[PDB]
RNA sequence: AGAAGGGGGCCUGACUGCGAGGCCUGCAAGCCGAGCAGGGGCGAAAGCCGGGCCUAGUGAACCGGUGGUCCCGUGUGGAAGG
RNA sequence: GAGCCCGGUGAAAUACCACCCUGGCGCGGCUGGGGGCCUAACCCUCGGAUGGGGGGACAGCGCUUGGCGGGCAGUUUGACUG
RNA sequence: ACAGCUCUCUGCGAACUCGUAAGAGGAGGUAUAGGGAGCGACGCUUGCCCGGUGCCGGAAGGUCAAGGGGAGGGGUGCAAGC
RNA sequence: GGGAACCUGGGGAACUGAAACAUCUCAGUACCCAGAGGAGAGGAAAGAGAAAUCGACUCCCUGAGUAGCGGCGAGCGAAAGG
RNA sequence: CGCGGGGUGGAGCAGCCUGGUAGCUCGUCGGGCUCAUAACCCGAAGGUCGUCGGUUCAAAUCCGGCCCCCGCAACCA
C-alpha cells in the first residue's frame, strides 16, 4: 500500500516473520533465479546467526569472533562427516574442490568470505549478517526479514529481494507479491 | 435502388489479387470488374395513421424520430412526404 | 436502447423508468404496444418534470398538514356536547366535531379523515388523529349544558 | 617425370584494397595478369601462395528475401520504408 | 518459522501463515456454442383485414469470408526444318 | 421427329427457364404432374468391372477464410497513454 | 418539348499500344441518359505546405516532361511557389 | 523460412508431460494337438529407450540443443 508498508507485520509470539514472495518468468532461455549471495541487507539484524568457518584449528580465537560465535577447523573433515544425524557450514576457497565431508555426508557451500586480511576485523562486514535465496521452481519468491519492531526504517526487504531482480532474463514480466508470513501477507508494488 | 432519408448508391470495382506480401515477396492482382454495392435496403411500416417506409438501413431510427410528431394531420393515405419534406 | 416504460413489466417494471434493450424489443413490441418510449431527451425532460410537477404537487397534501399540525395539535376542541353524566344522549359525529372546529374557529374540517370509528355517545376524554400518512391527533374534550 | 604425378610437415593468399598492360570482341559478357599498399602462410634463403595441369561444370536486369554500414529519413525529433 | 516440532531416518519433515506449479468444484463478469417454446418484425395467405389464419429470427435482401463454377468471356497454344 | 422404355430432378412461393428486379412461364398444373437426359413401334433380351470420374449418402476425425483470441514482441512519449 | 457545338452530373466500351497477352494502354476517350444557359462548373479554407510564409474561385504562361507513378514494361504524370 | 509431430525386444503400436517399477500385438524356437495339419495350449531369449549433454537422489520419461523421419504451410524474380 502506497509505498511498501513495513509494520504491516503485526499476534503470535515474537513477530520475526516478514517475507518477500514474488514471481516472474521461469527460465527465459539461459538464467533463472540467482539473488545476491549474502547481500548487504540494510538491517542491523542482531541475528546472532551461529556461522561456522571450517578454516583451520589455528583460527579458534577470532574465527569464533569472526562475526558469529562458534567456529571449529579441519578436524571436521573426517571426525564430523560420518553418519545421518552427526555429519552455517563453510569450506575452502581459491580452487580447492574441498567437497568431501560437505557434499554428501548440502547445507551451505559455495565460497567463504574472501577476507585473508583477517577472519574477524573492524573493517570487514557481512559474513554472519546477510541472506540469500537461489531458485524455487514452480514456486519461487521468499526472502529474509527481521522482527516486528521497525518503523519506516526496516526498508531492507524492499532493496535486497526486490532489487535482486537483476538475475531475470527475457521472456515475460515479473508480477504479484506480498511481504508477510506466520501472520498473513499483504502486497506492495515497486 | 431508392433511399428515403438516405441515397441511391455506388458501383465500385472488385480488385482481385493472387498476390504475395510486400511483407514477404512481391505481389499482384489478376483483375477486377464493375461491382454493385447495393446501398443496404430494408423497409419499415410504422404509424402516423399507418404509413410505409423503405427506410435506408443506416438511418433506420431516423424514421422513428419523424414518427414522434403530431402536427394535426388527416386523411392523406400518403401522409409521409408530409413528414419527409419537413425532415432534416 | 434507453427507454421509459409503463405497465410495469417483469425484469424491468418500475414504471416510468429507464432501461436499455435491443432496438428490436422496443422497436417492435414495447414501442408498438404503448408500453414504453424512446430515450428521447424530449419525452425524457418532459417526463422528468411530470415528476417534480407532481412530487411537490402532492407534497402539499403533506405540506399543508404541518401548518395544520402545529395548530390542531395543542388547541383542543371542548364540545358543548349536550349530555349529562352516564350514557350520553346525542353521540359525537364529526358532523359535530368538524362542526365544532370548522363551524367554530373557521378552520378546515374533514368529517371522515378524522379517525372517528363510532360516535362515542358518552362523556370523557379522547385523542384521535387526523388522517392519513403523517398525522395530527386533535385532543378533543366533551362538556355539559 | 629437369612434374602438374606418388608421399610426408606445417598452414588456410579457396585474403581485403586495386590494377599498368593485353587477348577475344558488333554490344553486353568471357579471358591471362605485372606490380603497389594492408595484414598473413611455408621457407635458412633467393622466393612462391589472390583456389584446383588446362580448357565445360552455368543464367543479364526486374522482383522479393536475409544479414550489416557510414548516407536519406517529407515542419523537427525518432521511427515505417528506401 | 517454534508452540500450538525436532525426533530416528530419508530426496525432502509436519503445529501454523505464505507465494505458487498440478487440478476440480463453489457463487459472479465479459464472451461463446448448442436444443427447446414464443410473436410481434420479415414471407405467404383469408368472403376487402383497424384484423384472422400458417411460417418465423428461419427464410428473403445489404456487406464481407472461402470455395464450386467452359454457363459465359478475354486469351495462350515457340522456333529451326531440302 | 415419332409414340413407347429407362434413369433422374421437383412438395408447391415446386424444380427449371427469362429477367438487375418487379413480374412471368411453369400452371389458374400438383407426382396417374412438370422439367432434364439417352433410346426410339412391336418380339426375345440387355450380361461382368465402383480402381480413377461424376453424383447420392456419412451430426467422427484431417485440413481451412474471415471473424473471435490474446501468451509474447516492437514504436514512441517524463509519463498516464496512443 | 427544341436547340450547331460549348459545361456538369449519372453510367460507360473495344480496336489499338505493349511488336504475343491477362495488370497496364487507348481512357474516364467514344457513346448513352439526365440537367443547366448564355455560358457552365468552381467559389471565401476543417486549404496549402515549411517560408518568422500564403490568403475564395476560375483561365493563360512558367514551374516541368521536373517530383513521382509503372508486368519500374509500354507508358502515365502532378503540386507549392513565380 | 514459418510452424510441430514420431524413433521402444525382429517388425509395426502404447508408456513419460503425473518421473520412480518397460507391457499389447506378430514373429523367432522348443515342447503340448493327429499320422500330420492349420484352429490350438504353454514356456521363452531378444532395447546402451537415437544421440551432444540440462535437471532430479534417480529420466523411457521433465525441458532444450541436434540427424532423418512426418503433416500443415505461403509464395516462387
Ligand atoms: Mg509461472
Ligand atoms: Mg547411524
Ligand atoms: Mg497467382
Ligand atoms: Mg502489379
Ligand atoms: Mg483490362
Ligand atoms: Mg449502425
Ligand atoms: Mg417532419
Ligand atoms: Mg444534418
Ligand atoms: Mg596444406
Ligand atoms: Mg571486360
Ligand atoms: Mg598476386
Ligand atoms: Mg583452389
Ligand atoms: Mg519486368
Ligand atoms: Mg515484379
Ligand atoms: Mg520526420
Ligand atoms: Mg516435541
Ligand atoms: Mg493457480
Ligand atoms: Mg464463469
Ligand atoms: Mg403465429
Ligand atoms: Mg403470424
Ligand atoms: Mg438470416
Ligand atoms: Mg472459350
Ligand atoms: Mg507462351
Ligand atoms: Mg521436311
Ligand atoms: Mg426426372
Ligand atoms: Mg397462373
Ligand atoms: Mg436414335
Ligand atoms: Mg429370355
Ligand atoms: Mg469403377
Ligand atoms: Mg469407394
Ligand atoms: Mg452429405
Ligand atoms: Mg484469425
Ligand atoms: Mg507504457
Ligand atoms: Mg429541356
Ligand atoms: Mg483490354
Ligand atoms: Mg499494349
Ligand atoms: Mg495481354
Ligand atoms: Mg490484357
Ligand atoms: Mg459571355
Ligand atoms: Mg456562373
Ligand atoms: Mg465561413
Ligand atoms: Mg486566359
Ligand atoms: Mg498557373
Ligand atoms: Mg530543367
Ligand atoms: Mg502556379
Ligand atoms: Mg518419439
Ligand atoms: Mg506411430
Ligand atoms: Mg526407427
Ligand atoms: Mg521401433
Ligand atoms: Mg507438464
Ligand atoms: Mg496374443
Ligand atoms: Mg506368436
Ligand atoms: Mg508362420
Ligand atoms: Mg506360433
Ligand atoms: Mg531362421
Ligand atoms: Mg501328413
Ligand atoms: Mg531382454
Ligand atoms: Mg548409457
Ligand atoms: Mg548394456
Ligand atoms: Mg524410450
Ligand atoms: Mg533401450
Ligand atoms: Mg516442453
Ligand atoms: Mg515451397
PDB file of N, CA, C and O (backbone and C1' of nucleotides) in Angstrom, chain D residues 39-65:
ATOM      1  P     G D  39      50.445  -3.800 -42.061  1.00  0.00           P
ATOM      2  O5'   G D  39      50.073  -5.218 -41.428  1.00  0.00           O
ATOM      3  C5'   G D  39      48.993  -5.361 -40.469  1.00  0.00           C
ATOM      4  C4'   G D  39      48.253  -6.657 -40.714  1.00  0.00           C
ATOM      5  C3'   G D  39      49.082  -7.930 -40.593  1.00  0.00           C
ATOM      6  O3'   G D  39      49.153  -8.410 -39.243  1.00  0.00           O
ATOM      7  C1'   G D  39      47.920  -7.942 -42.663  1.00  0.00           C
ATOM      8  P     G D  40      50.224  -9.557 -38.851  1.00  0.00           P
ATOM      9  O5'   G D  40      49.581 -10.875 -39.471  1.00  0.00           O
ATOM     10  C5'   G D  40      50.395 -12.000 -39.843  1.00  0.00           C
ATOM     11  C4'   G D  40      49.635 -12.898 -40.789  1.00  0.00           C
ATOM     12  C3'   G D  40      50.393 -14.127 -41.244  1.00  0.00           C
ATOM     13  O3'   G D  40      50.218 -15.162 -40.295  1.00  0.00           O
ATOM     14  C1'   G D  40      49.434 -13.060 -43.118  1.00  0.00           C
ATOM     15  P     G D  41      51.429 -16.163 -39.985  1.00  0.00           P
ATOM     16  O5'   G D  41      51.355 -17.217 -41.183  1.00  0.00           O
ATOM     17  C5'   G D  41      50.266 -18.172 -41.281  1.00  0.00           C
ATOM     18  C4'   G D  41      50.522 -19.155 -42.406  1.00  0.00           C
ATOM     19  C3'   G D  41      51.948 -19.672 -42.490  1.00  0.00           C
ATOM     20  O3'   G D  41      52.105 -20.790 -41.630  1.00  0.00           O
ATOM     21  C1'   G D  41      51.221 -18.967 -44.637  1.00  0.00           C
ATOM     22  P     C D  42      53.502 -21.029 -40.878  1.00  0.00           P
ATOM     23  O5'   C D  42      54.380 -21.730 -41.996  1.00  0.00           O
ATOM     24  C5'   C D  42      53.903 -22.895 -42.674  1.00  0.00           C
ATOM     25  C4'   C D  42      54.790 -23.188 -43.846  1.00  0.00           C
ATOM     26  C3'   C D  42      56.264 -22.936 -43.586  1.00  0.00           C
ATOM     27  O3'   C D  42      56.877 -24.001 -42.875  1.00  0.00           O
ATOM     28  C1'   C D  42      55.658 -22.053 -45.699  1.00  0.00           C
ATOM     29  P     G D  43      58.155 -23.695 -41.959  1.00  0.00           P
ATOM     30  O5'   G D  43      59.258 -23.236 -43.010  1.00  0.00           O
ATOM     31  C5'   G D  43      59.699 -24.140 -44.031  1.00  0.00           C
ATOM     32  C4'   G D  43      60.708 -23.474 -44.941  1.00  0.00           C
ATOM     33  C3'   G D  43      61.896 -22.774 -44.285  1.00  0.00           C
ATOM     34  O3'   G D  43      62.948 -23.699 -43.938  1.00  0.00           O
ATOM     35  C1'   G D  43      60.995 -21.437 -46.043  1.00  0.00           C
ATOM     36  P     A D  44      63.820 -23.475 -42.597  1.00  0.00           P
ATOM     37  O5'   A D  44      64.080 -21.904 -42.605  1.00  0.00           O
ATOM     38  C5'   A D  44      64.906 -21.278 -41.613  1.00  0.00           C
ATOM     39  C4'   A D  44      66.013 -20.484 -42.271  1.00  0.00           C
ATOM     40  C3'   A D  44      65.632 -19.638 -43.480  1.00  0.00           C
ATOM     41  O3'   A D  44      65.069 -18.381 -43.102  1.00  0.00           O
ATOM     42  C1'   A D  44      67.682 -20.783 -43.880  1.00  0.00           C
ATOM     43  P     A D  45      64.010 -17.659 -44.070  1.00  0.00           P
ATOM     44  O5'   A D  45      64.839 -17.387 -45.404  1.00  0.00           O
ATOM     45  C5'   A D  45      65.986 -16.521 -45.387  1.00  0.00           C
ATOM     46  C4'   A D  45      66.767 -16.647 -46.675  1.00  0.00           C
ATOM     47  C3'   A D  45      66.058 -16.255 -47.968  1.00  0.00           C
ATOM     48  O3'   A D  45      66.121 -14.831 -48.189  1.00  0.00           O
ATOM     49  C1'   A D  45      67.230 -18.313 -48.251  1.00  0.00           C
ATOM     50  P     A D  46      64.951 -14.075 -49.013  1.00  0.00           P
ATOM     51  O5'   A D  46      65.396 -14.233 -50.536  1.00  0.00           O
ATOM     52  C5'   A D  46      66.628 -13.650 -51.027  1.00  0.00           C
ATOM     53  C4'   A D  46      66.956 -14.209 -52.394  1.00  0.00           C
ATOM     54  C3'   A D  46      65.820 -14.100 -53.402  1.00  0.00           C
ATOM     55  O3'   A D  46      65.772 -12.867 -54.103  1.00  0.00           O
ATOM     56  C1'   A D  46      66.591 -16.330 -53.351  1.00  0.00           C
ATOM     57  P     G D  47      64.359 -12.339 -54.656  1.00  0.00           P
ATOM     58  O5'   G D  47      63.631 -13.678 -55.135  1.00  0.00           O
ATOM     59  C5'   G D  47      62.188 -13.798 -55.141  1.00  0.00           C
ATOM     60  C4'   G D  47      61.784 -15.252 -55.011  1.00  0.00           C
ATOM     61  C3'   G D  47      60.290 -15.544 -55.083  1.00  0.00           C
ATOM     62  O3'   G D  47      59.841 -15.661 -56.443  1.00  0.00           O
ATOM     63  C1'   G D  47      61.253 -16.690 -53.235  1.00  0.00           C
ATOM     64  P     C D  48      58.430 -15.008 -56.892  1.00  0.00           P
ATOM     65  O5'   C D  48      57.337 -16.121 -56.549  1.00  0.00           O
ATOM     66  C5'   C D  48      57.313 -17.385 -57.247  1.00  0.00           C
ATOM     67  C4'   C D  48      56.490 -18.404 -56.482  1.00  0.00           C
ATOM     68  C3'   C D  48      55.102 -17.947 -56.090  1.00  0.00           C
ATOM     69  O3'   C D  48      54.176 -18.076 -57.139  1.00  0.00           O
ATOM     70  C1'   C D  48      56.147 -18.921 -54.212  1.00  0.00           C
ATOM     71  P     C D  49      52.867 -17.163 -57.125  1.00  0.00           P
ATOM     72  O5'   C D  49      52.027 -17.736 -55.906  1.00  0.00           O
ATOM     73  C5'   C D  49      51.452 -19.048 -55.963  1.00  0.00           C
ATOM     74  C4'   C D  49      50.590 -19.278 -54.754  1.00  0.00           C
ATOM     75  C3'   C D  49      49.677 -18.109 -54.397  1.00  0.00           C
ATOM     76  O3'   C D  49      48.475 -18.039 -55.186  1.00  0.00           O
ATOM     77  C1'   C D  49      50.852 -18.814 -52.463  1.00  0.00           C
ATOM     78  P     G D  50      47.994 -16.616 -55.800  1.00  0.00           P
ATOM     79  O5'   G D  50      46.973 -16.064 -54.713  1.00  0.00           O
ATOM     80  C5'   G D  50      45.903 -16.886 -54.226  1.00  0.00           C
ATOM     81  C4'   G D  50      44.598 -16.142 -54.342  1.00  0.00           C
ATOM     82  C3'   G D  50      44.127 -15.829 -55.764  1.00  0.00           C
ATOM     83  O3'   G D  50      42.697 -15.927 -55.853  1.00  0.00           O
ATOM     84  C1'   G D  50      44.528 -13.807 -54.572  1.00  0.00           C
ATOM     85  P     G D  51      42.014 -16.654 -57.124  1.00  0.00           P
ATOM     86  O5'   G D  51      42.203 -18.229 -56.875  1.00  0.00           O
ATOM     87  C5'   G D  51      43.504 -18.781 -56.508  1.00  0.00           C
ATOM     88  C4'   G D  51      43.433 -20.274 -56.202  1.00  0.00           C
ATOM     89  C3'   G D  51      43.150 -21.257 -57.337  1.00  0.00           C
ATOM     90  O3'   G D  51      44.369 -21.573 -58.027  1.00  0.00           O
ATOM     91  C1'   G D  51      41.920 -21.846 -55.383  1.00  0.00           C
ATOM     92  P     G D  52      44.335 -22.325 -59.453  1.00  0.00           P
ATOM     93  O5'   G D  52      44.010 -23.843 -59.091  1.00  0.00           O
ATOM     94  C5'   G D  52      44.902 -24.610 -58.256  1.00  0.00           C
ATOM     95  C4'   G D  52      44.337 -25.993 -58.002  1.00  0.00           C
ATOM     96  C3'   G D  52      44.276 -26.930 -59.204  1.00  0.00           C
ATOM     97  O3'   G D  52      44.594 -28.247 -58.793  1.00  0.00           O
ATOM     98  C1'   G D  52      42.085 -26.589 -58.314  1.00  0.00           C
ATOM     99  P     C D  53      45.882 -28.978 -59.395  1.00  0.00           P
ATOM    100  O5'   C D  53      45.761 -28.788 -60.973  1.00  0.00           O
ATOM    101  C5'   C D  53      46.451 -29.687 -61.882  1.00  0.00           C
ATOM    102  C4'   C D  53      47.191 -28.900 -62.941  1.00  0.00           C
ATOM    103  C3'   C D  53      46.274 -28.140 -63.869  1.00  0.00           C
ATOM    104  O3'   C D  53      45.929 -26.914 -63.253  1.00  0.00           O
ATOM    105  C1'   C D  53      47.918 -29.292 -65.148  1.00  0.00           C
ATOM    106  P     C D  54      44.416 -26.411 -63.300  1.00  0.00           P
ATOM    107  O5'   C D  54      44.180 -26.137 -64.850  1.00  0.00           O
ATOM    108  C5'   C D  54      45.012 -25.189 -65.550  1.00  0.00           C
ATOM    109  C4'   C D  54      44.706 -25.199 -67.026  1.00  0.00           C
ATOM    110  C3'   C D  54      43.235 -25.215 -67.390  1.00  0.00           C
ATOM    111  O3'   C D  54      42.686 -23.910 -67.289  1.00  0.00           O
ATOM    112  C1'   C D  54      44.421 -26.768 -68.743  1.00  0.00           C
ATOM    113  P     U D  55      41.158 -23.711 -66.816  1.00  0.00           P
ATOM    114  O5'   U D  55      40.523 -22.978 -68.077  1.00  0.00           O
ATOM    115  C5'   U D  55      39.342 -23.476 -68.698  1.00  0.00           C
ATOM    116  C4'   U D  55      39.576 -23.704 -70.166  1.00  0.00           C
ATOM    117  C3'   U D  55      38.345 -24.268 -70.838  1.00  0.00           C
ATOM    118  O3'   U D  55      37.473 -23.205 -71.167  1.00  0.00           O
ATOM    119  C1'   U D  55      40.204 -25.617 -71.382  1.00  0.00           C
ATOM    120  P     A D  56      36.248 -22.874 -70.180  1.00  0.00           P
ATOM    121  O5'   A D  56      35.717 -24.337 -69.850  1.00  0.00           O
ATOM    122  C5'   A D  56      34.767 -24.550 -68.826  1.00  0.00           C
ATOM    123  C4'   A D  56      33.592 -25.285 -69.388  1.00  0.00           C
ATOM    124  C3'   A D  56      32.490 -25.529 -68.387  1.00  0.00           C
ATOM    125  O3'   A D  56      31.652 -24.375 -68.410  1.00  0.00           O
ATOM    126  C1'   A D  56      32.909 -27.475 -69.714  1.00  0.00           C
ATOM    127  P     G D  57      31.761 -23.281 -67.237  1.00  0.00           P
ATOM    128  O5'   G D  57      30.994 -23.999 -66.033  1.00  0.00           O
ATOM    129  C5'   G D  57      29.682 -24.578 -66.237  1.00  0.00           C
ATOM    130  C4'   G D  57      29.492 -25.790 -65.363  1.00  0.00           C
ATOM    131  C3'   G D  57      29.889 -25.610 -63.908  1.00  0.00           C
ATOM    132  O3'   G D  57      28.837 -25.036 -63.161  1.00  0.00           O
ATOM    133  C1'   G D  57      30.633 -27.712 -64.721  1.00  0.00           C
ATOM    134  P     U D  58      29.163 -23.946 -62.035  1.00  0.00           P
ATOM    135  O5'   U D  58      28.587 -22.602 -62.661  1.00  0.00           O
ATOM    136  C5'   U D  58      29.263 -21.980 -63.761  1.00  0.00           C
ATOM    137  C4'   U D  58      28.278 -21.520 -64.804  1.00  0.00           C
ATOM    138  C3'   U D  58      27.117 -20.687 -64.308  1.00  0.00           C
ATOM    139  O3'   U D  58      27.477 -19.348 -64.117  1.00  0.00           O
ATOM    140  C1'   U D  58      26.352 -22.249 -65.909  1.00  0.00           C
ATOM    141  P     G D  59      26.492 -18.402 -63.300  1.00  0.00           P
ATOM    142  O5'   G D  59      25.264 -18.144 -64.297  1.00  0.00           O
ATOM    143  C5'   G D  59      25.374 -17.180 -65.382  1.00  0.00           C
ATOM    144  C4'   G D  59      24.023 -16.572 -65.713  1.00  0.00           C
ATOM    145  C3'   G D  59      23.068 -16.297 -64.546  1.00  0.00           C
ATOM    146  O3'   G D  59      22.365 -15.078 -64.787  1.00  0.00           O
ATOM    147  C1'   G D  59      21.975 -17.558 -66.198  1.00  0.00           C
ATOM    148  P     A D  60      22.350 -13.902 -63.686  1.00  0.00           P
ATOM    149  O5'   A D  60      22.324 -12.609 -64.607  1.00  0.00           O
ATOM    150  C5'   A D  60      23.220 -12.523 -65.727  1.00  0.00           C
ATOM    151  C4'   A D  60      22.995 -11.254 -66.491  1.00  0.00           C
ATOM    152  C3'   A D  60      22.406 -10.088 -65.723  1.00  0.00           C
ATOM    153  O3'   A D  60      23.322  -9.421 -64.890  1.00  0.00           O
ATOM    154  C1'   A D  60      21.507 -10.176 -67.906  1.00  0.00           C
ATOM    155  P     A D  61      22.782  -8.704 -63.566  1.00  0.00           P
ATOM    156  O5'   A D  61      22.030  -7.416 -64.111  1.00  0.00           O
ATOM    157  C5'   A D  61      21.154  -6.686 -63.246  1.00  0.00           C
ATOM    158  C4'   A D  61      19.991  -6.113 -64.024  1.00  0.00           C
ATOM    159  C3'   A D  61      18.703  -5.971 -63.222  1.00  0.00           C
ATOM    160  O3'   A D  61      18.672  -4.755 -62.477  1.00  0.00           O
ATOM    161  C1'   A D  61      18.253  -6.991 -65.320  1.00  0.00           C
ATOM    162  P     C D  62      17.911  -4.715 -61.073  1.00  0.00           P
ATOM    163  O5'   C D  62      16.402  -4.980 -61.493  1.00  0.00           O
ATOM    164  C5'   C D  62      15.724  -4.103 -62.399  1.00  0.00           C
ATOM    165  C4'   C D  62      14.338  -4.624 -62.662  1.00  0.00           C
ATOM    166  C3'   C D  62      13.574  -4.993 -61.402  1.00  0.00           C
ATOM    167  O3'   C D  62      12.916  -3.871 -60.831  1.00  0.00           O
ATOM    168  C1'   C D  62      13.449  -6.767 -62.957  1.00  0.00           C
ATOM    169  P     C D  63      12.918  -3.687 -59.239  1.00  0.00           P
ATOM    170  O5'   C D  63      12.159  -4.987 -58.719  1.00  0.00           O
ATOM    171  C5'   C D  63      10.797  -5.250 -59.119  1.00  0.00           C
ATOM    172  C4'   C D  63      10.271  -6.492 -58.431  1.00  0.00           C
ATOM    173  C3'   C D  63      10.645  -6.603 -56.971  1.00  0.00           C
ATOM    174  O3'   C D  63       9.721  -5.851 -56.229  1.00  0.00           O
ATOM    175  C1'   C D  63      11.070  -8.660 -58.043  1.00  0.00           C
ATOM    176  P     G D  64      10.163  -5.224 -54.832  1.00  0.00           P
ATOM    177  O5'   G D  64       9.811  -6.402 -53.827  1.00  0.00           O
ATOM    178  C5'   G D  64      10.757  -6.839 -52.866  1.00  0.00           C
ATOM    179  C4'   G D  64      10.461  -8.251 -52.450  1.00  0.00           C
ATOM    180  C3'   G D  64      11.463  -8.741 -51.428  1.00  0.00           C
ATOM    181  O3'   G D  64      11.049  -8.390 -50.114  1.00  0.00           O
ATOM    182  C1'   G D  64      11.421 -10.242 -53.234  1.00  0.00           C
ATOM    183  P     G D  65      12.142  -7.919 -49.032  1.00  0.00           P
ATOM    184  O5'   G D  65      12.649  -9.295 -48.429  1.00  0.00           O
ATOM    185  C5'   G D  65      11.746 -10.394 -48.261  1.00  0.00           C
ATOM    186  C4'   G D  65      12.521 -11.673 -48.176  1.00  0.00           C
ATOM    187  C3'   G D  65      13.662 -11.623 -47.179  1.00  0.00           C
ATOM    188  O3'   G D  65      13.212 -11.873 -45.849  1.00  0.00           O
ATOM    189  C1'   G D  65      14.461 -12.459 -49.236  1.00  0.00           C
TER     190        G D  65
END
